[PDB]
Amino acid sequence: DLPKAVVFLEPQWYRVLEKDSVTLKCQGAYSPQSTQWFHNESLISSQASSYFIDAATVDDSGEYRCQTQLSTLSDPVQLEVHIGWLLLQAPRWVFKEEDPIHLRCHSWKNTALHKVTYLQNGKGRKYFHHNSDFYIPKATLKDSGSYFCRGLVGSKNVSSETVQITITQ
Amino acid sequence: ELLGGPSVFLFPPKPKDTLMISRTPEVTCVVVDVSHEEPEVKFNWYVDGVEVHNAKTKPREEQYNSTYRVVSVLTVLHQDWLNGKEYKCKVSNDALPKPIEETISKAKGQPREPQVYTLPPSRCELTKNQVSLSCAVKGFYPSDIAVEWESNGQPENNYKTTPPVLDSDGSFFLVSKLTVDKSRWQQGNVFSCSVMHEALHNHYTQKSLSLS
Amino acid sequence: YWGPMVFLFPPKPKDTLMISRTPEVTCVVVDVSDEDPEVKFNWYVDGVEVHNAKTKPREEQYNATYRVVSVLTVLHQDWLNGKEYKCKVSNKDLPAPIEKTISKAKGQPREPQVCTLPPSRDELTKNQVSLWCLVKGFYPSDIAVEWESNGQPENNYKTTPPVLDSDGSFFLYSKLTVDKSRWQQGNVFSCSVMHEALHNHYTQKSLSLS
Ligand SMILES: *[C@@H]1O[C@H](CO[C@H]2O[C@@H](C)[C@@H](O)[C@@H](O)[C@@H]2O)[C@@H](O[C@@H]2O[C@H](CO)[C@@H](O[C@@H]3O[C@H](CO[C@H]4O[C@H](CO)[C@@H](O)[C@H](O)[C@@H]4O[C@@H]4O[C@H](CO)[C@@H](O[C@@H]5O[C@H](CO)[C@H](O)[C@H](O)[C@H]5O)[C@H](O)[C@H]4NC(C)=O)[C@@H](O)[C@H](O[C@H]4O[C@H](CO)[C@@H](O)[C@H](O)[C@@H]4O[C@@H]4O[C@H](CO)[C@@H](O)[C@H](O)[C@H]4NC(C)=O)[C@@H]3O)[C@H](O)[C@H]2NC(C)=O)[C@H](O)[C@H]1NC(C)=O
Ligand SMILES: *[C@@H]1O[C@H](CO[C@H]2O[C@@H](C)[C@@H](O)[C@@H](O)[C@@H]2O)[C@@H](O[C@@H]2O[C@H](CO)[C@@H](O[C@@H]3O[C@H](CO[C@H]4O[C@H](CO)[C@@H](O)[C@H](O)[C@@H]4O[C@@H]4O[C@H](CO)[C@@H](O[C@@H]5O[C@H](CO)[C@H](O)[C@H](O)[C@H]5O)[C@H](O)[C@H]4NC(C)=O)[C@@H](O)[C@H](O[C@H]4O[C@H](CO)[C@@H](O)[C@H](O)[C@@H]4O[C@@H]4O[C@H](CO)[C@@H](O)[C@H](O)[C@H]4NC(C)=O)[C@@H]3O)[C@H](O)[C@H]2NC(C)=O)[C@H](O)[C@H]1NC(C)=O
Ligand SMILES: *[C@@H]1O[C@H](CO)[C@@H](O[C@@H]2O[C@H](CO)[C@@H](O[C@@H]3O[C@H](CO[C@H]4O[C@H](CO)[C@@H](O)[C@H](O)[C@@H]4O)[C@@H](O)[C@H](O[C@H]4O[C@H](CO)[C@@H](O)[C@H](O)[C@@H]4O)[C@@H]3O)[C@H](O)[C@H]2NC(C)=O)[C@H](O)[C@H]1NC(C)=O
Ligand SMILES: *[C@@H]1O[C@H](CO)[C@@H](O[C@@H]2O[C@H](CO)[C@@H](O)[C@H](O)[C@H]2NC(C)=O)[C@H](O)[C@H]1NC(C)=O
């Protein structure tokens, strides 16, 4: 009868750093709608279609659900607010063979980061002078494993937590 | 333009301070690159992960690269440093995403007792007006060691000690060279070489040397 | 800011002193990106350009960076006479080329004194004995110390780095570990030193159980 509402993230990253901005949008019916937001399964007084987080704190973590008047309650969406200098972000972490793998090494407060290295299982894969996205056009099974990025913020040597990338056949 | 915010460096106590019970061994936490805009720096100290509150903070000093430098000092217990306790300096500042932690400990590995030998002047100095006395200290681990010279109770002023050198077995060796006038050597004067290390009995040893 | 860093290294003391050997000055370019083009080198011995430098191609490192190494062969006396050596690192998308310069340490050259020390009696009653060589009163710190038995190279030795003495000159200690039996046989061990302030850049000192 009624469409199942869907929570989208803008930007798409479900893992963020403190102080980043996250906009949560609610897709109920396609025609632009009384919107209702949930965080940690309790209502937020925000009735707008978008729920804007200006600067993320650790409390912004948890499940998120939305419901418009012309839609059914949405599936939950997790949000992880991390504390640190660097976070390795990706659209997804599960890749089919020959799919593109596109990663970014995001810095806290968008601090200029230079001499960036992306590492797989302890070995470096790619080095840039300035911060740049890591990109593999065609995924193989050898591209599977544990990934983290590092670099210099000014003179300080900083690194992100490792994330696991798997390649399915 | 201090993009990274302040950075932290943690220094160990001086070898001699940990060995003599009458001395005061200190662990030093130096914080550099503190910005004028965000100068407030908070220190937290942990001994084996347990917070202590007896640290002294020295006041902030301006540097010529227009940045601040703050030093915190913690006096450690002699036995605790020697037994391999970890000392953690935790530093807070608003230019950082989270407090920065540093950790120091006495070098891991089994301690080895040094061997001390004295070596009379070489044949090369028979014509020279002054002579070199050598103090070979070898087979010690870790490199934390101190060496001094004395004659008739009075400490000798004219000596240089080579840095610890890694030997083939993993232990360290060094040599201390005392320079004295030949005439003092002609006379049956006794010079002594005092060596301090954690693996020595009572943290002390002394070897003497004379024209016998 | 460009990215890659440049380091210039001096030749090994032995190479500069032994006439049969080849002393080299090495220019290393680290942190070369894959997106960097071809790195070009220009060498200058007192402003004057030379073109005898064999430059190795870019080499991939374990951290995904690249390393370009350029080696120049230098004349023995050129280095000793205190000549300036420039390395010019140039790239297609580089605003100003990086220039690095090194030369032999300046100051009054002082001849080393070689002093052999027999093993301590208080060590003579152990499995292996150690022989000592006090090399002192030399400037600059650039030196090479070696051991031989009856004129043939001995391996089992360790040397302290040069230490600054009260008079401004340097000294060091070399320890050679030998089997007590080889010392008892009356074999002639010798401590050989190479330094710029020595005649023929070489001297030697005998040591044996008399
Ligand atoms: C702005 O200016 C700041 C300083 O002022 C400068 O201004 C000008 C005038 C200029 O000309 C300078 O000369 C002047 O200093 C400047 O701050 C500096 O930042 C540097 C980093 O950017 C720091 O470099 C580090 O140095 C460490 C060693 O420091 C000692 O030695 C140097 C001389 O070599 C000396 O200058 C220092 O003061 C320091 O001396 C020691 O001081 C302690 C404590 O004060 C003494 O302890 C004694 O203790 C007894 C107790 O019994 C007693 O209480 C005494 O009173 C007490 O003094 C020591 O005796 C004394 N030692 C000596 C020999 O004198 C290095 O260890 C360190 O290396 C580490 O980091 C490197 C990367 O940065 C890395 O390459 C290296 O591998 C190493 O990495 C570490 O490795 C460890 C394992 O081995 C790991 O566990 C670590 O995690 C790891 N760390 C990291 C980060 O990776 C480093 O090179 C410099 O110390 C500091 N200077 C001062 C004075 O604070 C600032 O950078 C400037 N800013 C800008 C933007 O330019
Ligand atoms: C990625 O990883 C890179 C390497 O990682 C590994 O990669 C593997 C594949 C494999 O290659 C591994 O081996 C390797 O570990 C890494 O590159 C590194 O970058 C560092 C900087 O970020 C460099 O540090 C510098 O080191 C200089 C000394 O380096 C020697 O010693 C180290 C070991 O400690 C060694 O690794 C080096 O290769 C080098 O060894 C010497 O090499 C020369 C030339 O090949 C040899 O000489 C020649 O020998 C041949 C015979 O073979 C022949 O006889 C020739 O005649 C002769 O010339 C030597 O034999 C050999 N010696 C030894 C003992 O081994 C330091 O001088 C330098 O210090 C200066 O700069 C620092 C700041 O950057 C500063 O802290 C310091 O105070 C000093 O400061 C100033 O520097 C200025 C210039 O910048 C000068 O103008 C000033 O004078 C000076 N001021 C003062 C007061 O001193 C520095 O620390 C490191 O060399 C380099 N390693 C290699 C292997 O290239 C890279 O960073 C990584 N990238 C990323 C993004 O993470
Ligand atoms: C930011 O901070 C990190 C430090 O955490 C830096 O990364 C380190 O970089 C140094 C180089 O400066 C690395 O040191 C080198 O590690 C190499 C690792 O080899 C691996 O693979 C082989 C298998 O082929 C294994 O044997 C080995 O166990 C390792 O798993 C070594 O090959 C290097 O050895 C060289 O030097 C030694 C001298 O003792 C020689 O004996 C060797 O012949 C050889 O020449 C060297 O030790 C270090 O490992 C890095 N650490 C990490 C965690 O990555 C960054 O560079 C720094 N800066 C930036 C801008 O990111
Ligand atoms: C919503 O729930 C999450 C738990 O999923 C809360 O996040 C935790 O917050 C505490 C500090 O308050 C941290 O120690 C935890 O690490 C956080 N958990 C995770 C998984 O990151 C969050 O605080 C809750 N927010 C509200 C408004 O109720």
Coordinates of N, CA and C in Angstrom, one line a residue, chain B residues 27-202:
Chain B
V27 N 61.6 11.5 35.0 CA 61.1 11.3 33.6 C 60.5 12.6 33.1
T28 N 61.0 13.0 31.9 CA 60.7 14.3 31.3 C 59.8 14.3 30.1
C29 N 58.7 15.0 30.2 CA 57.7 15.1 29.1 C 57.7 16.5 28.4
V30 N 58.3 16.6 27.3 CA 58.5 17.8 26.5 C 57.4 18.0 25.5
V31 N 56.7 19.1 25.5 CA 55.6 19.4 24.5 C 56.1 20.6 23.7
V32 N 56.2 20.4 22.4 CA 56.5 21.5 21.5 C 55.4 21.9 20.5
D33 N 55.6 22.9 19.7 CA 54.6 23.3 18.7 C 53.2 23.7 19.3
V34 N 53.2 24.3 20.4 CA 52.0 24.8 21.0 C 51.8 26.2 20.5
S35 N 50.6 26.4 19.9 CA 50.2 27.6 19.2 C 49.8 28.7 20.2
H36 N 50.0 30.0 19.8 CA 49.6 31.1 20.6 C 48.1 31.2 20.8
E37 N 47.4 30.8 19.9 CA 45.9 30.8 19.9 C 45.3 29.7 20.9
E38 N 46.0 28.6 21.0 CA 45.6 27.5 21.8 C 46.8 27.1 22.7
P39 N 47.1 27.8 23.8 CA 48.3 27.6 24.6 C 48.1 26.7 25.8
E40 N 46.9 26.5 26.3 CA 46.6 25.7 27.5 C 46.9 24.2 27.2
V41 N 47.8 23.7 28.1 CA 48.3 22.3 28.0 C 48.1 21.6 29.3
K42 N 47.4 20.4 29.3 CA 47.1 19.7 30.5 C 47.9 18.3 30.5
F43 N 48.5 18.0 31.6 CA 49.3 16.8 31.8 C 48.6 15.7 32.6
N44 N 48.7 14.5 32.2 CA 48.3 13.3 33.0 C 49.4 12.2 33.0
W45 N 49.7 11.8 34.2 CA 50.8 10.8 34.3 C 50.2 9.4 34.8
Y46 N 50.8 8.3 34.3 CA 50.3 7.0 34.6 C 51.5 6.1 34.8
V47 N 51.6 5.4 36.0 CA 52.6 4.4 36.3 C 52.0 3.1 36.2
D48 N 52.4 2.3 35.2 CA 51.7 1.0 34.9 C 50.2 1.2 34.8
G49 N 49.8 2.2 34.0 CA 48.4 2.5 33.8 C 47.6 3.1 35.0
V50 N 48.4 3.4 36.1 CA 47.8 3.9 37.3 C 48.2 5.4 37.5
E51 N 47.2 6.3 37.6 CA 47.4 7.7 37.6 C 48.1 8.2 38.9
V52 N 49.2 9.0 38.8 CA 49.8 9.6 39.9 C 49.7 11.1 39.8
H53 N 49.8 11.8 40.9 CA 49.5 13.2 41.0 C 50.7 14.1 41.6
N54 N 51.9 13.6 41.5 CA 53.1 14.3 42.1 C 54.0 14.9 41.0
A55 N 53.5 15.1 39.8 CA 54.3 15.7 38.7 C 54.3 17.2 38.9
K56 N 55.5 17.8 38.5 CA 55.6 19.3 38.5 C 55.7 19.8 37.1
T57 N 54.9 20.8 36.8 CA 54.8 21.5 35.5 C 55.7 22.7 35.5
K58 N 56.7 22.8 34.6 CA 57.4 24.0 34.4 C 56.6 25.0 33.5
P59 N 56.8 26.3 33.7 CA 56.0 27.3 33.0 C 56.4 27.4 31.5
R60 N 55.4 27.7 30.6 CA 55.7 27.8 29.2 C 56.7 28.8 28.7
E61 N 57.6 28.3 27.9 CA 58.7 29.2 27.4 C 58.5 29.5 25.9
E62 N 58.6 30.7 25.5 CA 58.5 31.2 24.1 C 59.7 30.7 23.4
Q63 N 59.6 30.2 22.2 CA 60.7 29.8 21.3 C 60.8 30.8 20.2
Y64 N 62.0 30.9 19.6 CA 62.3 31.8 18.5 C 61.6 31.5 17.2
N65 N 61.1 30.3 17.0 CA 60.2 30.0 15.9 C 58.7 30.3 16.3
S66 N 58.5 31.3 17.2 CA 57.2 31.8 17.6 C 56.2 30.7 18.1
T67 N 56.7 29.7 18.8 CA 55.9 28.6 19.3 C 56.2 28.4 20.8
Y68 N 55.3 27.8 21.5 CA 55.5 27.5 23.0 C 56.1 26.2 23.2
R69 N 56.8 26.0 24.4 CA 57.4 24.8 24.8 C 57.1 24.6 26.3
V70 N 56.4 23.5 26.6 CA 56.0 23.2 28.0 C 56.6 21.8 28.4
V71 N 57.2 21.8 29.6 CA 57.9 20.6 30.1 C 57.2 20.2 31.5
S72 N 56.8 18.9 31.5 CA 56.4 18.3 32.8 C 57.4 17.3 33.3
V73 N 57.7 17.2 34.6 CA 58.7 16.4 35.1 C 58.1 15.5 36.3
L74 N 58.3 14.2 36.2 CA 57.9 13.3 37.2 C 59.1 12.5 37.8
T75 N 59.2 12.6 39.1 CA 60.3 11.9 39.8 C 59.8 10.5 40.1
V76 N 60.6 9.5 39.5 CA 60.2 8.1 39.6 C 60.9 7.4 40.8
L77 N 60.3 6.3 41.3 CA 61.0 5.5 42.3 C 62.1 4.6 41.7
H78 N 63.3 4.6 42.3 CA 64.4 3.9 41.8 C 64.1 2.4 41.4
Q79 N 63.5 1.7 42.3 CA 63.2 0.3 42.2 C 62.2 0.1 41.0
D80 N 61.2 1.0 40.9 CA 60.1 1.0 39.9 C 60.6 1.1 38.5
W81 N 61.6 2.0 38.2 CA 62.2 2.2 36.9 C 63.0 0.9 36.6
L82 N 63.8 0.4 37.5 CA 64.6 -0.7 37.3 C 63.9 -2.0 37.1
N83 N 62.7 -2.1 37.7 CA 61.9 -3.3 37.5 C 61.0 -3.3 36.2
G84 N 61.2 -2.3 35.4 CA 60.6 -2.2 34.1 C 59.2 -1.6 34.0
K85 N 58.8 -0.8 35.0 CA 57.5 -0.1 35.0 C 57.4 0.9 33.8
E86 N 56.2 0.9 33.2 CA 55.9 1.8 32.1 C 55.4 3.1 32.6
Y87 N 55.9 4.2 32.1 CA 55.5 5.6 32.4 C 54.9 6.3 31.3
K88 N 53.6 6.6 31.4 CA 52.8 7.2 30.4 C 52.5 8.7 30.6
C89 N 52.9 9.5 29.6 CA 52.6 11.0 29.6 C 51.4 11.2 28.7
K90 N 50.3 11.7 29.2 CA 49.1 12.0 28.4 C 48.9 13.5 28.3
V91 N 48.9 14.0 27.1 CA 48.9 15.5 26.9 C 47.6 15.9 26.2
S92 N 46.9 16.9 26.7 CA 45.7 17.5 26.2 C 45.9 18.9 25.6
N93 N 45.3 19.2 24.5 CA 45.3 20.5 23.9 C 44.2 20.6 22.9
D94 N 43.7 21.8 22.7 CA 42.5 22.1 21.9 C 42.8 22.0 20.4
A95 N 44.1 22.0 20.0 CA 44.5 21.9 18.6 C 44.6 20.4 18.2
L96 N 44.2 19.5 19.1 CA 44.3 18.1 18.9 C 42.9 17.4 18.8
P97 N 42.8 16.3 18.0 CA 41.5 15.6 18.0 C 41.3 14.8 19.2
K98 N 42.4 14.3 19.9 CA 42.3 13.6 21.1 C 43.7 13.7 21.9
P99 N 43.7 13.5 23.2 CA 44.9 13.6 23.9 C 46.0 12.7 23.4
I100 N 47.2 13.2 23.3 CA 48.4 12.4 22.8 C 49.1 11.7 24.0
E101 N 49.4 10.4 23.8 CA 50.0 9.6 24.8 C 51.4 9.1 24.4
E102 N 52.4 9.1 25.3 CA 53.7 8.6 25.0 C 54.1 7.6 26.2
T103 N 54.9 6.7 25.9 CA 55.3 5.6 26.9 C 56.8 5.3 26.8
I104 N 57.4 5.3 28.0 CA 58.8 4.9 28.1 C 59.0 3.9 29.2
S105 N 60.0 3.0 29.1 CA 60.3 2.0 30.0 C 61.8 1.7 29.9
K106 N 62.4 1.2 30.9 CA 63.8 0.7 30.8 C 63.8 -0.4 29.7
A107 N 64.9 -0.4 28.9 CA 65.0 -1.3 27.8 C 64.8 -2.7 28.2
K108 N 63.9 -3.4 27.5 CA 63.6 -4.8 27.7 C 64.8 -5.7 27.4
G109 N 64.9 -6.9 28.0 CA 66.0 -7.8 27.9 C 66.7 -8.1 29.2
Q110 N 67.4 -9.2 29.3 CA 68.0 -9.6 30.5 C 69.3 -8.8 30.8
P111 N 69.4 -8.2 32.0 CA 70.7 -7.5 32.3 C 71.9 -8.4 32.5
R112 N 73.0 -7.9 31.9 CA 74.3 -8.6 32.0 C 75.3 -7.7 32.7
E113 N 76.1 -8.4 33.6 CA 77.1 -7.7 34.4 C 78.3 -7.3 33.6
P114 N 78.7 -6.0 33.7 CA 79.9 -5.5 33.0 C 81.2 -6.1 33.6
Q115 N 82.2 -6.2 32.8 CA 83.6 -6.6 33.3 C 84.5 -5.4 33.1
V116 N 85.2 -5.0 34.2 CA 86.0 -3.8 34.2 C 87.5 -4.2 34.2
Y117 N 88.2 -3.7 33.3 CA 89.7 -3.9 33.2 C 90.4 -2.5 33.0
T118 N 91.5 -2.4 33.7 CA 92.4 -1.2 33.5 C 93.5 -1.6 32.6
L119 N 94.0 -0.6 31.9 CA 95.1 -0.8 30.9 C 96.1 0.3 31.0
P120 N 97.4 0.0 31.5 CA 98.5 0.9 31.6 C 98.8 1.6 30.3
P121 N 99.6 2.7 30.3 CA 100.0 3.5 29.1 C 100.7 2.6 28.1
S122 N 100.4 2.8 26.8 CA 101.0 2.2 25.7 C 102.4 2.6 25.5
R123 N 103.2 1.8 24.8 CA 104.6 2.0 24.5 C 104.8 3.3 23.7
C124 N 103.8 3.8 23.1 CA 103.8 5.0 22.2 C 104.1 6.3 23.0
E125 N 103.7 6.3 24.3 CA 103.8 7.5 25.1 C 105.1 7.6 26.0
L126 N 106.0 6.6 25.8 CA 107.3 6.6 26.6 C 108.1 7.9 26.4
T127 N 108.0 8.6 25.3 CA 108.7 9.8 25.0 C 107.8 11.0 25.3
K128 N 106.5 10.8 25.2 CA 105.5 11.9 25.4 C 105.4 12.3 26.9
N129 N 105.0 13.6 27.1 CA 105.1 14.2 28.4 C 103.8 13.9 29.3
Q130 N 102.8 13.3 28.7 CA 101.6 12.8 29.4 C 101.2 11.4 28.9
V131 N 100.5 10.7 29.8 CA 100.1 9.3 29.5 C 98.6 9.1 29.6
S132 N 98.1 8.1 28.8 CA 96.7 7.8 28.8 C 96.5 6.5 29.6
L133 N 95.5 6.5 30.5 CA 95.1 5.3 31.2 C 93.7 4.9 30.7
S134 N 93.6 3.6 30.4 CA 92.4 3.1 29.8 C 91.5 2.3 30.8
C135 N 90.2 2.5 30.7 CA 89.3 1.7 31.5 C 88.3 1.0 30.6
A136 N 88.5 -0.3 30.3 CA 87.7 -1.1 29.4 C 86.5 -1.7 30.2
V137 N 85.3 -1.3 29.8 CA 84.1 -1.9 30.4 C 83.3 -2.6 29.3
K138 N 83.1 -3.9 29.5 CA 82.5 -4.7 28.5 C 81.6 -5.8 29.0
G139 N 80.6 -6.2 28.1 CA 79.7 -7.3 28.5 C 78.5 -6.9 29.2
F140 N 78.1 -5.6 29.1 CA 77.0 -5.0 29.9 C 75.7 -4.8 29.0
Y141 N 74.6 -5.0 29.6 CA 73.3 -4.7 29.0 C 72.3 -4.3 30.2
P142 N 71.5 -3.2 30.0 CA 71.5 -2.3 28.8 C 72.7 -1.3 28.8
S143 N 72.7 -0.4 27.8 CA 73.7 0.6 27.7 C 73.8 1.7 28.8
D144 N 72.8 1.7 29.6 CA 72.7 2.7 30.8 C 73.8 2.4 31.8
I145 N 74.8 3.3 31.7 CA 76.1 3.1 32.4 C 76.7 4.5 32.7
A146 N 77.5 4.6 33.8 CA 78.3 5.8 34.1 C 79.7 5.4 34.6
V147 N 80.7 6.2 34.2 CA 82.1 5.9 34.5 C 82.8 7.2 35.0
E148 N 83.5 7.1 36.1 CA 84.3 8.2 36.6 C 85.7 7.8 37.0
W149 N 86.6 8.8 37.1 CA 88.0 8.6 37.5 C 88.3 9.4 38.8
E150 N 89.1 8.8 39.6 CA 89.6 9.4 40.9 C 91.0 8.9 41.3
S151 N 91.7 9.8 42.0 CA 93.0 9.5 42.5 C 93.2 10.2 43.9
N152 N 93.5 9.4 44.9 CA 93.7 9.8 46.3 C 92.4 10.4 46.9
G153 N 91.2 9.9 46.4 CA 89.9 10.4 46.8 C 89.4 11.5 45.9
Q154 N 90.3 12.4 45.4 CA 89.9 13.5 44.6 C 89.5 13.0 43.2
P155 N 88.4 13.5 42.6 CA 88.0 13.1 41.3 C 88.9 13.8 40.2
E156 N 89.2 13.0 39.2 CA 90.1 13.4 38.1 C 89.3 14.2 37.1
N157 N 90.0 15.3 36.5 CA 89.3 16.2 35.7 C 89.5 15.9 34.2
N158 N 90.6 15.3 33.8 CA 91.0 15.2 32.4 C 90.7 13.8 31.8
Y159 N 89.4 13.5 31.6 CA 89.0 12.2 31.0 C 87.8 12.3 30.0
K160 N 87.8 11.4 29.1 CA 86.7 11.3 28.1 C 86.2 9.8 28.0
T161 N 84.9 9.6 28.0 CA 84.4 8.2 27.9 C 83.7 8.1 26.6
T162 N 84.1 7.0 25.8 CA 83.4 6.7 24.5 C 82.0 6.2 24.8
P163 N 81.1 6.5 23.8 CA 79.7 6.0 23.9 C 79.7 4.5 23.9
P164 N 78.6 3.9 24.4 CA 78.4 2.4 24.4 C 78.4 2.0 22.9
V165 N 79.1 0.9 22.7 CA 79.2 0.3 21.3 C 78.6 -1.1 21.4
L166 N 77.7 -1.5 20.5 CA 77.1 -2.8 20.4 C 78.1 -3.8 20.0
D167 N 78.3 -4.9 20.8 CA 79.2 -5.9 20.5 C 78.5 -7.1 19.8
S168 N 79.3 -8.1 19.4 CA 78.7 -9.2 18.5 C 77.8 -10.1 19.3
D169 N 77.8 -10.1 20.6 CA 77.0 -11.0 21.4 C 75.7 -10.4 21.9
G170 N 75.5 -9.1 21.6 CA 74.3 -8.3 22.0 C 74.6 -7.4 23.2
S171 N 75.7 -7.7 23.9 CA 76.1 -6.8 25.1 C 76.8 -5.6 24.6
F172 N 77.0 -4.6 25.4 CA 77.7 -3.4 25.1 C 79.1 -3.3 25.7
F173 N 79.9 -2.5 25.1 CA 81.2 -2.2 25.6 C 81.6 -0.7 25.4
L174 N 82.4 -0.2 26.3 CA 83.0 1.2 26.1 C 84.3 1.3 26.8
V175 N 85.0 2.3 26.5 CA 86.3 2.6 27.1 C 86.4 4.0 27.6
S176 N 86.9 4.2 28.8 CA 87.1 5.6 29.3 C 88.6 5.8 29.4
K177 N 89.0 7.0 28.8 CA 90.4 7.3 28.8 C 90.7 8.5 29.7
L178 N 91.6 8.3 30.7 CA 92.1 9.3 31.6 C 93.5 9.8 31.1
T179 N 93.7 11.1 31.0 CA 94.9 11.6 30.7 C 95.6 12.3 31.9
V180 N 96.8 11.9 32.2 CA 97.5 12.4 33.4 C 99.0 12.6 33.0
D181 N 99.7 13.5 33.7 CA 101.1 13.8 33.5 C 101.9 12.6 33.7
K182 N 103.0 12.4 32.9 CA 103.8 11.2 33.0 C 104.5 11.1 34.4
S183 N 104.9 12.2 34.9 CA 105.5 12.3 36.2 C 104.7 11.7 37.4
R184 N 103.4 12.0 37.3 CA 102.4 11.4 38.3 C 102.4 9.9 38.1
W185 N 102.6 9.4 36.9 CA 102.7 8.0 36.6 C 104.0 7.4 37.1
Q186 N 105.1 8.1 36.8 CA 106.4 7.7 37.3 C 106.4 7.3 38.8
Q187 N 105.8 8.2 39.5 CA 105.5 8.0 41.0 C 104.4 6.9 41.1
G188 N 104.5 6.1 42.1 CA 103.6 4.9 42.3 C 102.1 5.3 42.6
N189 N 101.7 6.4 42.0 CA 100.3 6.9 42.3 C 99.2 6.0 41.8
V190 N 98.2 5.8 42.6 CA 97.1 4.9 42.2 C 95.9 5.7 41.7
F191 N 95.5 5.4 40.5 CA 94.3 5.9 39.9 C 93.2 4.9 39.9
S192 N 92.0 5.3 40.0 CA 90.8 4.4 40.1 C 89.7 4.7 39.1
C193 N 89.1 3.6 38.6 CA 88.0 3.7 37.6 C 86.7 3.2 38.2
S194 N 85.8 4.1 38.6 CA 84.5 3.7 39.2 C 83.5 3.5 38.1
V195 N 82.7 2.4 38.1 CA 81.7 2.1 37.1 C 80.4 1.8 37.8
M196 N 79.3 2.4 37.3 CA 78.0 2.2 37.9 C 77.0 1.6 36.8
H197 N 76.4 0.5 37.2 CA 75.5 -0.2 36.4 C 74.5 -1.0 37.2
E198 N 73.3 -1.3 36.7 CA 72.2 -1.9 37.4 C 72.5 -3.4 37.8
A199 N 73.4 -4.0 37.0 CA 73.7 -5.4 37.1 C 74.9 -5.7 38.1
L200 N 75.5 -4.6 38.5 CA 76.6 -4.7 39.5 C 76.1 -4.8 40.9
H201 N 76.8 -5.5 41.8 CA 76.5 -5.6 43.2 C 76.6 -4.2 43.8
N202 N 75.5 -3.8 44.4 CA 75.4 -2.5 45.1 C 75.5 -1.3 44.0

